[PDB]
Amino acid sequence: GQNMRVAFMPWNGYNFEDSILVSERVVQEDRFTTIHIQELACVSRDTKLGPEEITADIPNVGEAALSKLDESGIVYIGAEVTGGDILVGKVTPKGETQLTPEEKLLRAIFGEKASDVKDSSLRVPNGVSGTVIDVQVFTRDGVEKDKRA
Amino acid sequence: RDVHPTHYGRVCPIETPEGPNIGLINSLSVYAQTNEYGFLETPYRKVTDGVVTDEIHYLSAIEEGNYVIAQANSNLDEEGHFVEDLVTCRSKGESSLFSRDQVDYMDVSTQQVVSVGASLIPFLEHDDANRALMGANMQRQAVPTLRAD
Amino acid sequence: MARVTVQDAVEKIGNRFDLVLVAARRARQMQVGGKDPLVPEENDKTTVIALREIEEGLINNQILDVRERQEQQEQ
Amino acid sequence: TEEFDAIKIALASPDMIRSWSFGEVKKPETINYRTFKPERDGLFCARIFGPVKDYECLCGKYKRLKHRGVICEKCGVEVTQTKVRRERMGHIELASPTAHIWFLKSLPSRIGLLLDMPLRDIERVLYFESYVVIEGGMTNLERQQILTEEQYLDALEEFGDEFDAKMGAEAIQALLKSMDLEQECEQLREELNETNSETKRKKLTKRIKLLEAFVQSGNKPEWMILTVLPVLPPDLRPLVPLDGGRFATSDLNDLYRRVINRNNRLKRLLDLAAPDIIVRNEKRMLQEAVDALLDNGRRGRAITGSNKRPLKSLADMIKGKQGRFRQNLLGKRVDYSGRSVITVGPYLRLHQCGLPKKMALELFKPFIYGKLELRGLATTIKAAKKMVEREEAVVWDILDEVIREHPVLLNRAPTLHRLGIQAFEPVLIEGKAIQLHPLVCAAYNADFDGDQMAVHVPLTLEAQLEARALMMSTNNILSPANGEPIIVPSQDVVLGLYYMTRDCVNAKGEGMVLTGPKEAERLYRSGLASLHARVKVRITEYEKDANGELVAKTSLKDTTVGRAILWMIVPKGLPYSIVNQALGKKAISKMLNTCYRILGLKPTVIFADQIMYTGFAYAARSGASVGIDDMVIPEKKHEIISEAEAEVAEIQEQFQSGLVTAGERYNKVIDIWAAANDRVSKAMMDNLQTETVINRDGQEEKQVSFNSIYMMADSGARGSAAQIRQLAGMRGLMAKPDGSIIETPITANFREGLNVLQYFISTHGARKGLADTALKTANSGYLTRRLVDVAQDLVVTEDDCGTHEGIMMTPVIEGGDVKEPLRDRVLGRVTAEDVLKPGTADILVPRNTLLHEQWCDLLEENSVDAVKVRSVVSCDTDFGVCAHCYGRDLARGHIINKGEAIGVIAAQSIGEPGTQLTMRTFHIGGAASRAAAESSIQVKNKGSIKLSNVKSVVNSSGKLVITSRNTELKLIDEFGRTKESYKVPYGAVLAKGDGEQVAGGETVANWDPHTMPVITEVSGFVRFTDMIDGQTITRQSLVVLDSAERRPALKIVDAQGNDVAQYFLPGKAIVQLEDGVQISSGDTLARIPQDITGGLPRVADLFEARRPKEPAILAEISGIVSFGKETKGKRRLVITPVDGSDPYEEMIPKWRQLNVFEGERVERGDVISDGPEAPHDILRLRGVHAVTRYIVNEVQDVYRLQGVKINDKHIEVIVRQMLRKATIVNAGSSDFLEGEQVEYSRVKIANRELEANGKVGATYSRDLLGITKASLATESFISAASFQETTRVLTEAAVAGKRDELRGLKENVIVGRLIPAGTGYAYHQDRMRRRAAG
Amino acid sequence: MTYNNVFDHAYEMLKENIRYDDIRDTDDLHDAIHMAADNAVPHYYADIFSVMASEGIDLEFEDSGLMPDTKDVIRILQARIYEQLTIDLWEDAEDLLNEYLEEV
Amino acid sequence: MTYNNVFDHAYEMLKENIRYDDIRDTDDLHDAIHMAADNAVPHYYADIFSVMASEGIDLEFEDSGLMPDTKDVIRILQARIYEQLTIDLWEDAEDLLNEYLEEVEE
Amino acid sequence: HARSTGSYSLVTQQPLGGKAQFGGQRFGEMEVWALEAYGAAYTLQEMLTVKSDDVNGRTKMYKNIVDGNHQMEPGMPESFNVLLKEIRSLGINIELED
C-alpha cells in the first residue's frame, strides 16, 4: 500500500467508530486508482446443420457501432467499450432456419437470427467503461482464420 | 483447532483465514524446514560451556521433548560468555528459570514465532493477537497501485 | 413541512391503524382526479398532505361518508 | 372477487361435479405430436379448459361464443362463472367407482378406516384374493367377516340365491348405506358408558367424535369413494426436476393416459361382456392405477425409489414441488431493493438518511416515467427511456421531485428484532455508498466496517403510510422489549459533551457576570475557554408547578462555560440537577430518558438531534489524540512484579518442601498474581493523576489530567477498566479452552516490549474468544422459529378486558442485595380496582388509570406493599385478546389500541440476547470454592421480620432452631414490601429464638453444610437399638442402622433413668452417638448433609415445558397423612386413610423422599419440595397463578445472570399461548373426558348457563405440554401442520369439517392475504361493518 | 412397517408369553412384559426411525429416570420406544389377563 | 424416498443463491451454502425421523467440529442433516460453478 | 444490486435481471416477522403476492405507476387460485361463503 499524513482527532462525525476520512488531494494525485482487467470469452456454437464460422456483417446494428470494429467481428486495439458497445460479433449459425416455409422476409432482412430479440451486446454487462488491451484468437489445425488473426 | 506449544517455531499461530475454518490452517514459519522423513524442524545454535558455537542444527519434536531450549530475547556478548546468572529459559514449553549451564541450545533470530505473512507488521507485541490476525486478513488482499510508494 | 411524527393526528382519532386507511381513501380521490385539496401544497407529495389533513382535524369517517354519498348522488 | 375467511374441506359431491362440468368424452386421442392442432374432445387437452390462445376458438362455427351451456364439436362454449383459465375443470366417468387411498391408508389407519374391523383384513379384501359379502342374514356368519374363494363358494352354495358380493368399493358403499350413523353412535356411547378398559376409552372417544364429525358435517361418507373425478389444468404443472422439456411431455401425462386407457378398456370389456377373471383383472389394474396416481403406495421403509419414479404422489407435488412454504420463505423477487456499503452521515436529522446517486436514479425509474408522462415532457415511453439514458438536468429535477418527501426502508440481513428494519427519508449523496444516521447502530447491532443494508422502496401509497406512520426511527424512541431508550450516543457525542462539561482550576476567565446566558460568544472571540471554573451566570428555567402550564424562574448559579452553552440546547426547562455533573453514557442516557418522560415525544427528538450536533461540533473542536505521553507506566510496577515473583519463589520453596500439592500451588499462584494485578491496577489509577496540568501547583489533587485514555475510562461509554489495564500496567491471565493457565503470566504491557513466549501464550486468549461468534447462531434462530410457531394466533381484537381477578404482583429479588425494585414492575400494566394504603378506607384509583411516572411518584412518596394487577389468562377473550391489561405499550406513548400484533414481538424480545452467556466475571482463575467461612444468612435492611413455616423446638440454650424444609422471611420496608429474598436452608441453625423480632444487626442464622437438624427436644439418653453389621456401608460415634438400605423414627426418651420425636428421612443418616450416653437437649444426635436455572438450553427447557429429572407429587385436600399410613407389601408411601373419602390413592415407586411429618391436615396447593417442581401438577391443583409466577421468575432468574432486561408481558403472553388443551372432568354436551380449546370451552359454558341448562360441562383442567402439540393446536388447516404432510392434514380437516374463523398471523402468510394485525385489522373491521351495514 | 405393526407384534408376543408361562398374577408379569418389550423392538436403525414417522408414539417422557445417560441419539429414542411400548403393554396385559381368564 | 426431495430442493435453492449472489470464486462461496444449510433442513421431528429413515444419510460424521454437544436429540438430528447437506453439496456447488460460467447466453 | 423490471421472467424474476448474472430472492425469513412486529399489512401484502409472486400484478402496478393511477387493487392474485386448483384436483373441493 501507500502511507499518508494522519491526524488523530475526533471529527464532526465523519469518523464514527473506525471510519476513514480522506482528502481531495489523494484524488488529485490519481492515487490507488485500480485497474481491473476482465476477460471477454467469446463463443461460436456448432450445431448439426449450418456453417461453423462466426463472421462479420451483422444486421440491425447502427453505423456508429460498426465504425469501431475491424473485419471478422473484432475491434481495434485501443477502442473504448462503454456498456452496451460491441466488442465481438456474436453469430448464430445458419442452421435450423433454412427449412422454414414461413419468415422469408425475416430471413431476407435479419437472416438465421444473427441477433437476439432484445438483449445487450456481448462485451461486459452494463455499467462499465474502458478500452481493450489484447486479443487472443487462437486457431485450430485447418480452420482458415487468417483474415481475423 | 487450539494451539499446542509445539507450534512455537514450526508453524505460526497468526495466519488463519477469516472463514469458518479458523485454527486448522497453520502457515509455515520463516526458518522452519521439512526433514527428510517429512516432519518440520526449526534451527537451533549450539551452546558450549564457555563459548557459544555459531553452527546450527535442525531439531524435531522428539528431540526437543528431552532437550532444553532457551528463549530468543536473552543477553549475549561478542565472545559468548553468559553474564547473567539466572537466564529465563524453558524445558518443555512452559517458561521457568534455569541456571547458566543447564541449557545447550539457543534461538538464532527473533523471527521463528511468526511466518512470512505477518512479518511485515512492526510491533506485534503492542498489538492484540486477534487484531494481528485481522491485520493479516487485511494484508492477504490488495490491488497493486500505480505509483507503488 | 416535513412531518416527523403523526402523533398529533392520533390525538384527534386514536387508533394509529385507522389513520393509514383513512388517509389512503382520502388521497386516492386526489391522486386519480375529480377532487380538489382543501390544504395547499408546500412542495411535497400527497402523503404529507394527507398527514397534515388528518393532523388539522378536518377529515374523519363521517366527512368521508357524507362526501361519498354526495358523489354517489351527483353521479 | 370475494375473500377466503372460513371454508371447510368437505367431500365433493358427484352432483356438484356433474353441475361443475357437463358433457360426454370418448376415444382419448388427446395430443398428436405431429400436428399440434386443436383436436377433438378427449381428456385433458385443448378441447377442455376453453381456448388455448386468449380470445378465439377453432370449432368450425360460432367462434364469438354467443350462447352458453353446450359442447358442440371440439371446444368449450360454456364458461358462465369466471375468466378463461379459472373456469371449470372437467370430469372422468368410471364404470366401477374406486375408493380414495387416503382414507384407506391415513398414516396409519387414522381417519377413514375404523368400522370395527382391522386394517389388514380390509387391505386383503380390497385385493384380488378376498371380498366382503353384503346383505346376508339367517346364517351363522355375519357381514363383517372375511371370505376366500372356496369360503365364498361354500357361502353361495349354502345361501343359494340373492347373494351380493362385489370386488370393488360398491359393497363398501352398500355396507356404509346400510349402517345407520345415529344408531351406531348411540351404541358406541353405550359401550363408552359400560366398558372400563383403558385402551378402549381413547378408541371409543375417537369413534364417537369422528361419527359426530360425520353427523354435524351434514355430508354423506359415500362421497369419499371416488365416482367422478375432476382433472387438473395442464399449465398447473411446473417444469420437471430433470432437464427442461414441455408441458405435454411431462411426467403426469403417462399416468393420466394409463388411467384413461384402463378406464376405456374396462368400458370396452363391459360392453363386450367379458368373463369374471378378465373384469376382476380390469378392476384390479384400475384400482392399482388410481392408488399409484394418488400417492406412491408405500407400505414400510420404502428402501429405494424406483429410479426416480416420475410423480409418484400428488402430495409430494403439493408439499414439495410447488411448495407448502410458497410465500415469504424462499425470498421471492425483492423487486427494486438493493444493497450497498453503509457509511456515516453527520447531518440529516433523525428521520432522514442518505442514498447514492446512481442507485436513486434507478430505484424510481417507473416513478420517473410516470412523472414525465404527467408533466408532458416525454411523449412516448421510448422517449422517456432515452431521456433516462441521456441523464440531462430536467431528469434530475423530476428525480428531486420524487425523492423530496418520499419514505424508504433500510433493512439489514440479521433482523433478530423489529428495529433491524427502519423507515427513513433519502437524500442524494455523491458516490455509490449509503450515508446513515450516526446514532442507529445499537438497534442495528453492527459497526461501520462494510456491513450491508437492503433499501426497500415503498411502491404503493399505503406502503408509504406504513413507512411514515409506524416504521420511522422517530416513532420508536424507547426499546420495544425493555423500556430503555434505544437511541444512545456512542463515544462521539459522549466525548464531546464530556469535554464540553469538564471543569478546571485557575483557567483564563473568572467571575463571569453574564446575561442571555450567551457563554459561547466569549469562547468564540477571545479570553474564555469552555472549561472554566465556577462562575455565576443567570440561567432561566421552566418548571411544571402549574398543571398544563410552564412556570418560569430566574436565578444566578455557579457553573462552567460548557454547561451554560449546553443550557441553550435544552428546550422548555428540564431540571438543572441532571446537567450539573460530568456527562458519560449513563448521564446522557438518563438526560434523554428524563427528557422523554417530561417533554413527551416532539421536543425529545429535536433535543437528541441538537445534542448530537453540538457533540459532533465540539468533539471536532476538541481534537483528542492518543500518544505515547498519554499511556503511563507505574513507577513501582516492576517492584510489585518483583514482589510477585518473590512470593512465587516462596511457593517454589513450598514446591520443594512437600507441604503444598499441585492444585493448592495452582490456586496460590492464581491468588498471588491476581493480587499483583489488583495492586498494579491501583498503582496505575494513582499514576493517572497529575500528568497534563495547567500552571498551578501546591493543591491536593493538582489538576486532574486531560489525557484521552483517562477521559475514556472515566466517561464509561466504551473505555472500561478491563482494557485500560490491558493497555497499561499488567495484562494478567489469559483464556484457554482446556481450562488451565500458565504459572508465570505476562508481566509487561502493550506499552513495554513483550517476550515471544508472552505473545505465544496471549494468542490462546484470542483463540478462545474467536470461536464464540460463529457458534449458536442457528440454535438462536431455531428458538425464535419455534416461539413464533407456537405463538402466531394472537392479535388484539377488543377494547375492555372486564375483570377483577388478576396475577398478584409481589416484589421479589435474587440472593444478596436488591436487583429489581417494585416500581419497575408496577409501571406499565394497568392495575385493578383496589390498591390499599396501610390506613383503612383509603384508595388511590376509582377503577383504573394509565400508569405513568406521576402514579409512580405517588407510590414512591407513599407506602405500598402489594399491588393487584389486571393481567393475562384470567378473563379470557373469545377469538383473540382484549389486551386492556396490556398497558403502556413500549416505544410509544398512548393507551393500547386494537389490532396490535402480540406474540411476534415476544419471540424477538426473548431472542434478543446474544450467542453465548458470559458469566465468568473474571479471568480463567479466581479460585471459586463452595464456601469460604459460612453461608451467611442475615437481614440487611431495617424493619421487623416474620418467619414462615417454622415451629417451636424445645432447646436447652436461649436460641430456638427449626427442622422445617421450607422457610421464608418477610421484611417490613414501607407497608409490608419484603425486597429481600434470602434462600433459607432446610432446617437452618437459628441463633435467634422464635417469636421475637428485631431490626438492625443481630445476624439470626449461622449455617454450615456439614450438619443436619436431627436433635432431641427432651433431655435424656439415646434410645437403645440393635448394632448389627451391614448398615455401616453408607456414604455421603459410629453409625448403627440405616433406613435407606433397609435412620428410622422411634420413640423419644423422656426420662434420665427410664428407656423410652418424629425423625424424617433425608436420604443419608449417620449416627453420631452411642447407645447409652447421657446427652442433653439441643445437642448433636446424628448429623450429615445430603432449582437449576441459567443457560441457553435452560431457556429451551423453560419454553418447551419438558418434564424435569425429579418430578414432584403435590398434596390435595385434607386427609390423614403420616409416615407409613398403611403402606403395602411393596412400593411404599401409599396414603390410604383420607377423612372425607376422596378416592384418590397414588402409588409411589419408593424413589421419592418422605413427604410430610407435620400437617396431619393439608390443603390443595401445598408445596412438597421434591427437588424440581412439576408445573403440570401445580397447574392442575394450585392454578394459573403459581405456574405463571414460576415460569416468569425462572425466566427472570435466567435473564439477570447477564444483565439483560426484558419485561414480563412478552413472557406472560407466551405462557398464555402455552395454556391451551383444556381437559374436562364433568361430561358436557358434545364432549366426554377429552381436551378441547379454552375459548370453545368458555363458549360451551356460556351457552349452557345462558338459556336452558343449569350447569352442563364444568371443572376443566389446563395442560402445559409445551412446544409439540400446542403449536399443532391451531385449529385452521392452513397452519395446522405446515411442516408435515399436507394431505394428511387435509383429510383430517375434511372429515372433521373444521372452520378457519380467522385467528392467526402466519396463516395469511402461508395462504396470502391482508393479515389481521396493524392496519389490516382496521380493514377487517371496516369490511365487517360494511357487510352488516349493507 | 408402522407403530401399529410393532404394537400388534408386542401384543402377539405378550399373548404367547402368557400362554407359555401361565401367569395369573399381576405382580408376576415383570419377567414377561419387559421381554415383550425386548423382542418387539427392531435392531435396524431405519426400522427404528420408520416407526417414529407414524402416529401412536410421542417424544415426551413420563419418567425421566428411565432415560440413560449417553451422548448419542439412537439410545435415547430407543429407550423412548421401550417406554411407550411398556406403557401400552401394562394396559394390554390387564385386558390379556382378563381374556386369558375368560378364554380357557 | 424423502431425502431425494430435500436434496433436490437444496440443489435448486443453492443454484438460485449462486445465481443471485453472482460470486465467482471458491474461497468466499460459503454463505450460499449457509443459505442451503439453514433453509432446506426440515423443522420438526416428523420429517426429521422420516428423512433419516430413508437412504442417503448416515449417523457417522465427517468433521468433528460441526458436531453439537447437547442432551436434546432434535438439535443433533438437525445438525446431522445440515452437515450432511453441506458435505453432499460442496462438490455439486463446484460442479454448478463449472456449468455456471457458460450457462446463460449473456 | 436492485435490478429493475426486466423481460423473460416466468416466476420470482429469477432469469435475466439487471446484473452480470441475476436472481431475485432473499427478502428474508426474519424480516417478514419484523414487518409482522410493526403491524405492516400492505408492505407484507407486497411481500406476499404483488411485488413478490405475480406476473400480471407487476404489469398492472407498472401501468398504475406510469399512467398515474396509483391503484393497488388488493386481493389474492393468482397464488390462492393455484392453491384452489391444486386442492380441488383431488376428491375434496373448496366452497365459497362469507
Residue numbers in the entry:
A (entry chain C): 797 to 945
B (entry chain C): 548 to 696
C (entry chain E): 1 to 75
D (entry chain D): 14 to 1049, 1058 to 1067, 1075 to 1088, 1097 to 1126, 1133 to 1376
E (entry chain G): 5 to 108
F (entry chain F): 5 to 110
G (entry chain C): 1244 to 1341
Manuscript text:
Ocr is abundantly expressed and forms a dimer that mimics the structure of a slightly bent 20 base pair B-form DNA and blocks the DNA binding grooves of the type I RM enzyme, preventing the degradation and modification of the T7 genome by the host. Our results with purified components show that Ocr can bind to RNAP and inhibit both σ70 and σ54 dependent transcription. Using structural biology, we show that the Ocr dimer directly binds to RNAP at the RNAP cleft, where sigma factors and the transcription bubble bind, suggesting that Ocr interferes with transcription recruitment by competing with sigma factor binding, and could also interfere with transcription initiation. During 3D classification, it is clear that a number of different conformational and structural classes exist within the dataset and two distinct classes were identified due to their widely differing RNAP clamp conformations.
In both of the distinct RNAP-Ocr complex structures, Ocr remains as a dimer upon binding to RNAP and the Ocr dimers are slightly less bent compared to that of an Ocr alone crystal structure. The second structure involves only one of the two Ocr subunits within the dimer contacting RNAP, occupying only the downstream DNA channel. Here the RNAP clamp is less open and we denote this structure the ‘narrow clamp structure’. In the narrow clamp mode, the proximal Ocr subunit interacts with the β’ clamp, again mimicking downstream DNA in RPo although the clamp is more open (~45 Å) compared to that in RPo (~35 Å). Interestingly, although an Ocr monomer surface mimics that of a dsDNA in the overall dimension and the negative charge distributions, the Ocr subunit in the narrow clamp structure does not exactly overlay with the downstream dsDNA in RPo when RNAP is aligned on its bridge helix, the highly conserved structural feature that is close to the active centre and connects β and β’ clamps. Instead Ocr is shifted upwards compared to the dsDNA in RPo. The downstream binding channel of RNAP consists of β and β’ clamps on two sides and the β’ jaw domain as a base, providing a positively charged environment on three sides, required to accommodate and engage with the negatively charged DNA during transcription. Although an Ocr monomer has a largely negatively charged surface, there are also positively charged patches on the Ocr surface, especially those facing the β’ jaw domain. In order to maintain the interactions between Ocr and the β’ clamp and to overcome charge repulsions with the β’ jaw, the β’ clamp is opened up, shifting Ocr upwards and away from the jaw domain. When the clamp is closed as in the transcriptional open complex, even though there is ample space to accommodate one Ocr subunit, the charge repulsion between the β’ jaw domain and the Ocr surface results in the opening of the β’ clamp, thus shifting Ocr upwards and away from the β’ jaw domain.
